[PDB]
Write a protein that binds this DNA or RNA. Sequence first.
DNA 1: GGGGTGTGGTAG
DNA 2: ATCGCTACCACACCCC
Length: 438
Amino acid sequence: IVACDDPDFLTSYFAHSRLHHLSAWKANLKDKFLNENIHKYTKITDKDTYIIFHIDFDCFFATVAYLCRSSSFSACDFKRDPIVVCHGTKNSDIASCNYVARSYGIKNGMWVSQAEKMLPNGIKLISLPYTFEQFQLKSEAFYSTLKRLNIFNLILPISIDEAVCVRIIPDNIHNTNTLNARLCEEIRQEIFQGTNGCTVSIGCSDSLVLARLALKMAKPNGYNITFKSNLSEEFWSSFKLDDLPGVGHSTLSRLESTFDSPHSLNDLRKRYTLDALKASVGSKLGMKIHLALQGQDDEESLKILYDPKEVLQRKSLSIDINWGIRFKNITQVDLFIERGCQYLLEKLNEINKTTSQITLKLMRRCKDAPIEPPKYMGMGRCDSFSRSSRLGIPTNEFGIIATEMKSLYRTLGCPPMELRGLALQFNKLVDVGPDNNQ
DNA sequence: GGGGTGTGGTAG
DNA sequence: ATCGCTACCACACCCC
Ligand SMILES: Nc1nc2c(ncn2[C@H]2C[C@H](O)[C@@H](COP(=O)(O)OP(=O)(O)OP(=O)(O)O)O2)c(=O)[nH]1
Ligand SMILES: [Ca+2]
Ligand SMILES: [Ca+2]
């Protein structure tokens, strides 16, 4: 047990937090890409015609947690029992569930208690612990197999378990669905062998958005090949509105309001006008959805292909702690803020940069919300407050940065016992070069 | 046209 | 119990 005023709190929280791990894995994969290509010019040009293979482990955490389960879960069966990965027993997030569990309507992000109600009597839920080290080891095998296949010109890391892989097609060569199926099957086979039991599904297309949709269509443990030329009503009819990239719950809600609760992309496709779309959700998002409903990427999504080194280049740096926050006085809040700054500055020095603008964000208990929320140590219902500040000269000096952070906290006026959440941000980063004469 | 701020939303 | 992170685009609204 490590409380928020204990010096070891940040380390222990991060060691336990799957969301932290997802972010740290993603950032390290982006840096590793940038290094390996420091002199290689890996880029797609307008000269190229390319095919996109979008590859993703199926139920990653669940699968790996199963394969590596301790002897205490030896008899559990991935194909027959509903399996989730989670820390706890009641209001604990389900980080991953297998497709058996999904067959009863369980979804990632659900609390265990709710997912327990969704099972008939006699069927028991299996709760496996996280295995973060082996999650990373299986990913290494994933990216190592991808590279040694030598069939891709650009291998883009999306996350620990997910990658967008790009093959350039010579006009000299006739690409066929026979070759593409074979590549998919090779990819799937090799990865199942290299990871010793994990499965990936693959979306294969000539746009990124179609490759993502194809991938959803491909799951579980399969592959799908859908080019712009194969688009059809049967295709669009098989997708929910929030299968579109960029469409989360808030955009979904707005689209359902504007267009009479479409229940598939085909419904939305046949009912929408671009103007009303822009009006409903926003001009740029409206245009991206419009382009996507034709199977076409917008210019914003396309940048990762034509200039991947600037897309994967870290532009800001931050930490967020919105769990376990229970401070009794301002002194303890200030020490926590310093611990956070120290951690962030360690990271900033690794990447040899300075910051010119910083931000403090906090969560504050809503005035009518219980002091102890339903989730043990959760933030509960909160109001958000942020404030930023430009620094005079770019710096990496703890003294300057931590002082401004604690001052930023001061101006937001949040009583320490009402604090439920804190984020610390370095918003603008500035390279440090060999020349540092004033 | 250029800048500024805080807030919202998405995604693994 | 239980580990509700974090990067970055877009937008509303302000200044010149
Ligand atoms: N989407 C989502 N995934 C999470 C979250 N926390 C942990 N994860 C885990 C689930 C996966 O094991 C891993 C990658 O996310 P995915 O989108 O691929 O979901 P998952 O692999 O569990 O199932 P699927 O790919 O649809 O077969 O991250 C979360 O809050 N949201
Ligand atoms: Ca996955
Ligand atoms: Ca996702």
